Design a protein around this ligand. Structure first.
Ligand SMILES: NC(=O)c1ccc[n+]([C@@H]2O[C@H](COP(=O)([O-])OP(=O)(O)OC[C@H]3O[C@@H](n4cnc5c(N)ncnc54)[C@H](O)[C@@H]3O)[C@@H](O)[C@H]2O)c1
Ligand SMILES: NC(=O)c1ccc[n+]([C@@H]2O[C@H](COP(=O)([O-])OP(=O)(O)OC[C@H]3O[C@@H](n4cnc5c(N)ncnc54)[C@H](O)[C@@H]3O)[C@@H](O)[C@H]2O)c1
Ligand SMILES: NC(=O)c1ccc[n+]([C@@H]2O[C@H](COP(=O)([O-])OP(=O)(O)OC[C@H]3O[C@@H](n4cnc5c(N)ncnc54)[C@H](O)[C@@H]3O)[C@@H](O)[C@H]2O)c1
Ligand SMILES: NC(=O)c1ccc[n+]([C@@H]2O[C@H](COP(=O)([O-])OP(=O)(O)OC[C@H]3O[C@@H](n4cnc5c(N)ncnc54)[C@H](O)[C@@H]3O)[C@@H](O)[C@H]2O)c1
Lengths: 307, 307, 306, 304, 306, 306
């Protein structure tokens, strides 16, 4: 009867946890991280590298599901090799080893970063070539393959979704590659102008936070019998910075945008431009709600409020 | 100056080691493992999960290259999945971290078990879908992705070869899926009959040991500038039990074979039937010298002696 | 029987080890570090790992640890927790085995133990010590803890506080007193140098042969000689402009520029000169190299290398 | 204070000079020769030119000449009248100056002062001396003249009879005991050597750092302990087959041939072993290196 | 064809040269010296001037050098630097010319090759030689070099070790054994003498006739009979009281005093008696004059002069 | 620019060299001799070796030779042939190089140029010179030849005839006027002296600072004020009894005995006094020390130095 979120305090978790609490009762969701929320009132410290500390939480709290968000992301992965390797692989391995022991089910999300330059670049399918260029990406492939294997070998109900770039009104950008899609709106509101660090024309899959929540929950609640697979690509839209610029000027016409590429372009070029998520459409009725324009308008009202 | 072989006591190691000592001199190959050679005379204990001990060997022995052979194979991988996961992922991480701190180069094997049932099974490409079902297999995707990532991130000269089934007269047969092809011969010679544990018709890629040693030394001495990839498929032939049996029976006609297929069959059929190794033919002039009938005559002659 | 040197592959080790081999024999020094030399008796030894040191002390018949291993002012500031761990756990392990095994110990200290509030001209042995850099503070711990093993358990423990050490052998690498080695490469390679200290930032300094002599002087002195365990050692003091001017005696066409950086804020917290009276009196410490001589020799040796 | 070395650029010199520098200060030692070193204070001094030595002594504050200059036994046999002039006029010049300027003198002698009528087993300090080489007969002249200057004029004269000296720094070139340096080079370059002495030609020998230690031991000894002026000094004795056997304890595969030449007829008139007990009692002479360890240490030092 | 005598105007030369002219013809001996006789074929030869010597040898058809020139023990100790040059350069030039022109050489050695460490009774031919005098160390170089030239270049080299030599004809030159010439002049002039040697300093000695005979005996011997190149030769051995006593057998009035000086400490380092049995064997050496008869003869002959 | 002194390490040299360094620069004086100072610019030079001088001249940029090197009257009488080679050959080689290199020379003479023929009271510059000692006669040859090089070749040659020279720095050394240095050592050490000249042997004498002032006065004089090239110079004349009486004005208990040796027959052939009226006219020669003042000053100076 209880769900343990790890990495609960990050971008996704900071909204995922309140939404699961909405759906299931405040008290049924155990939120955990290595940093406290920015209230909450049912929070625990958990470093996912420390397997015993996690056994402790699982047992004391009556946990039957781990929503494992804890990760180091693309930037810190590039910045610091072995720590990312260590948090991300040791996290999934501890999490999965615990699920088999106590019979937990687990969700852990993947990422479009699992894809490389030799991965087909348009309408990228669910089973395809995976040769990532980033530490973050390669640790994510292991997640997948290790979670599938725990499924197949021990029947650990293991599930996952490859997130596209996620746009949120609530977490401050963390210097990642898709994060030009969050910074932009701040700068739009503060200065009426942005300098973007991707080529004008770097197309990427992106999705607005509520759809990310909807997808996360949709697969977590899907009855197990409908799942042709364990990990699903999911998308909402693909856009280029030039489109989101133009989308913003529909509401705020005076807004401008410079372009000054840095190393992040080189990363973006190795990732999908668009993802084929048909398989989630069919199996578990996956359906996004927000297009480019509505996400742009909603983001704009929210952050213009957040001041 | 010196070469460090890890897992130097394995099947491949018990022969790679002497060979490397013929090419560069006895004193120039540091032979290490957690089991003594079954003299050697330049043997050190080295548990690849212990980074510092390795730091100690590398420093003391004047090592510039690591030929990382250490691994748990597919049998023990399934029987004891936690173990394999820590020796394989942690032995390769420590090797790369050291290769980086000490500017080493590294050779580490991959395997055909990197591939899965959604991988195109005839003429398997170097760059393809990889969704292996075995613990052993998925630890080897990680070996591949992290070696490649060290190459591109830190200039660690990392190189690898996907061994197919390997046959030899000197290492004792284990519980491997491709191992039937080592047993068959002992059973030919001792009884005049064998019962194989795969179906009559499960095609696999295989290679006789001197080609294995060949390919290993060709990839390792190739000049860096001719290598378009870091990891390469290598093959020699491909055959079914049915056909290695007929081959044996042309040398010993009274040999019979019988077929009782265990779980190793459900491992076998998720593997390639043939691998496309053109890229290694192209880049570093990979050429095998043993077809089936010549490895059979040779196996047969050599075990006849060894008894 | 044997001496173990830790950190034996740094700037001082790579010249201190072969010198002690001369004086004692080659089989009599166990060289150890975490990187090989750029040996005969070389062993890998991470001085944060006490067991391994126990092993080396035991299998080698060690009776003296000349404990060079340390992170320096640069990595100290850039990775502070790492510095604090190698330098503190290193001195604690070495001291804790000196006691268990009846071992003698030499550990260098440094002028960086001194602070803004230390009198900075003819700085005495016993004085205010409030360093500003992680490196400095770890070395006050060095001093305090070796002193206390001495008075508490009779571990024969000795150090010397090195000033900036100058040498041909070892490459420069981001330290504050390093300007005094880079200067020479730049003069030989290019006729000129951009110095990162103010022209007038007086520091105490010594040329390796005197660093070596002082090390062996305190190490070989009879124990009944030493009114203290730590000693200030100096040779000369000078400014960047003075050594510039010294170079120009031999290479008239040499020029110097000053773009000062973070290292100036380090340099002005340290002494301008050091009172080493007490080493001169206790164990007849006497330096041989002044600035012109060291300059001359630096240029001759480097020119050979390059 | 200041010490003049003559012949400082040869085999013994090039390692004695830096050792004296470490003991006394770089600046205290005037290194001189007729070749430059292959420094700081090097000067050209041909020891047959007396008054060039007068110049050097006077300008440099010399109080002691360490007179290493000589032609050796090969050049001695190959060109006798030059060896005669260098060896004999050189000691006479040094001792004459020593007397004008109140200098001390160190001038080595040699096991070659002995010949076929000398008892050749633990040969004593005071014994029959009828040597067959030009080089040895010049060195009895050295001893007799040094001792005479000591008795007659108070010139503090001292000497040590070297056995064969083995070292890593100078490279061989023709002596009779050079066999024990060649062998090492050939051991390492080829895995084999041809010895030009009989398998069993036993001779007293000494590794360099001992040689250096015996040289400074006599030099520093206080004058009142010295019962004589010249001292036999030895470390060990061995035959080429023993040094071969020694090397094989490190390099099992090393092999050795015997093609004896004229140096055999030289080695044969030399001692097998020398009695240095007098140097052991008057000034505490003690060798540190036996066969097996000089062989160990030569092999490492040459390999590097 | 001809014989060159060096040093031919010395005590030995002035009687060796007429003896040789009787055996071989007046004209067959080239007498030479740096002083003239008290002759005919006399030439000036300074034996430290090699080419004057080559001159004489080639012009005069010389095939044998009888090399007498030397400074004795007296001028050896007084002017020790010149003794060194005449004695070492003379035998060197004479050996170098003997090799170039294929000459035989005779060159006298002396009992002063022996020192205090030499066994002093029946002193053998091969034995310890640590002479204390310049004169004796130069003569060891004489022997050693002459032997070397023999074994090396086939120079026919021969010496005898003269014991003290007694003769009438030559004026005693304050050498050490030459008390035994003085004694006689004083005996006849004064009936009394003062000996500068202790009363019991035993020395080997020989009367001039036996000197000549030995010189000639060694010179004419066939080379195939010589087991060695230098030979001990004696006739008798005696003390001053022993010679004093012999004299007083003819001149019973004769009295003697003893006032010892430095020459005593010379005499103390020499043999008391020499063993010359190798020569008596090899080449039939045999003296004719014992003490009493050399005493009777000196007295007659010296009565003759004066 | 530079001055070479020969024999620089002698009685006068030992003080002439530092005085010249004071007046000219440490660096402008090249000290030289065949023995070291008992400095910082000292070279060996034997003045009988012309080219070693040529080397020094050329290498040191010398323009003036101050030629002090000489054997003096006792080595002269003891070793006459050597005296002759040093004094006549050193002047010769000095003057021959002055000519080739256009050098100036100062070379001193001596009152020993005069003999028993010389009128001995108020002896003129130009007078009879029949000296009886080797030293003397070599010095007449220095003069005559120095003058010749002056007249024939324009070599600026100058000399002074020193009378006995007295100083506190250089130990006496068995010369004739040396009694007047000896005397003071004996006064202070034993309170008493035995003089080797007659009590009444009157001789010219000059205290060292006057000796340095006459030397530099001639050397510095302008060339045109000089009517001669060689000058008598003097200060006082006394007998040994005069200096005895003078010594007693400070040291009343002092006593002097008289035992003449060979040195009296030297003294007796020297002038009693000299006429230096010419050096006084031409170059303003004026001495400063009379008997009494040199005696007080010698006594104090020596007393401090024992
Ligand atoms: N935001 C996106 O665009 C995106 C895209 C693909 C996948 N995802 C995945 O969603 C998950 C959460 O995403 P996010 O954007 O909120 O990441 P984030 O970096 O914002 O938050 C991750 C959280 O994990 C925590 N953490 C770090 N190390 C830890 C450890 N050792 N133990 C426990 N917690 C630790 C951090 O404190 C942080 O709160 C991650 O697995 C991530 O890969 C996000
Ligand atoms: N034989 C084949 O058909 C084949 C095929 C593909 C790849 N390979 C690869 O070749 C390499 C060696 O192959 P092998 O067949 O000789 O395997 P193997 O099982 O015969 O030998 C592996 C060796 O590793 C040692 N080992 C196990 N754990 C260790 C640890 N923690 N530290 C150090 N050593 C450890 C074992 O003692 C053994 O000696 C492996 O990476 C394997 O995946 C082999
Ligand atoms: N260079 C100077 O001017 C100077 C001045 C004062 C004091 N010192 C002191 O002298 C000693 C040696 O100085 P240096 O200048 O040669 O320093 P360095 O930085 O050149 O070398 C120090 C050595 O420590 C080794 N090391 C680092 N961590 C280690 C660990 N855990 N275990 C073992 N070895 C480790 C490094 O590899 C290196 O060889 C240090 O104690 C230093 O603080 C140097
Ligand atoms: N090496 C041995 O085994 C050994 C043994 C016994 C004695 N010694 C003695 O030790 C002394 C030095 O030994 P070494 O083996 O180095 O001899 P060496 O031949 O190596 O060196 C002698 C040096 O003297 C120099 N020299 C030659 N002629 C000279 C001259 N006219 N003036 C100045 N220098 C001149 C040569 O250039 C040479 O460097 C010698 O006296 C030798 O007799 C050596």
């Amino acid at each position: 009867s209880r769900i343990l979120v790890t990495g609960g305090t990050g971008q996704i978790g900071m909204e995922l946890v309140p939404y699961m609490r909405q759906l299931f009762g405040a008290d049924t969701i155990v939120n955990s991280d290595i940093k406290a929320p920015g209230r909450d009132g049912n929070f625990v410290y958990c470093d996912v590298q420390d397997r015993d500390s996690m056994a402790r939480i699982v047992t004391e709290q009556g946990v039957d599901t781990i929503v494992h968000m804890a990760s180091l992301l693309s930037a810190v992965g590039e910045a610091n090799p072995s720590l990312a390797l260590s948090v991300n692989t040791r996290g999934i391995q501890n999490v999965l080893e615990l699920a088999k022991q106590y019979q937990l089910r687990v969700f852990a999300p993947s990422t479009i970063a699992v894809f490389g330059p030799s991965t087909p670049q348009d309408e990228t399918p669910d089973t395809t070539i995976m040769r990532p260029t980033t530490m973050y990406g390669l640790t994510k492939v292991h997640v997948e393959l290790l979670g599938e294997y725990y499924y197949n070998k021990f029947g650990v109900d293991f599930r996952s979704v490859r997130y596209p770039g996620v746009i949120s009104s609530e977490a401050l950008p963390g210097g990642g590659t898709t994060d030009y899609a969050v910074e932009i709106f701040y700068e739009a509101l503060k200065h009426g102008k942005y300098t973007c660090f991707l080529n004008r024309d770097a197309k990427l899959p992106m999705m607005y936070m509520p759809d990310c929540l909807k997808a996360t929950m949709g697969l977590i609640n899907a009855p197990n019998d409908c799942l042709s697979q364990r990990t699903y690509n999911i998308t909402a839209v693909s856009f280029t910075p030039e489109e989101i610029v133009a989308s913003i000027q529909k509401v705020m016409p005076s807004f401008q945008c410079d372009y000054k590429p840095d190393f992040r372009q080189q990363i973006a070029e190795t990732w999908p431009r668009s993802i084929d998520d048909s398989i989630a459409r069919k199996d578990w009725n996956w359906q996004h709600d927000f297009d480019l324009d509505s996400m742009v308008e909603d983001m704009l009202v929210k952050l213009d409020a957040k001041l």
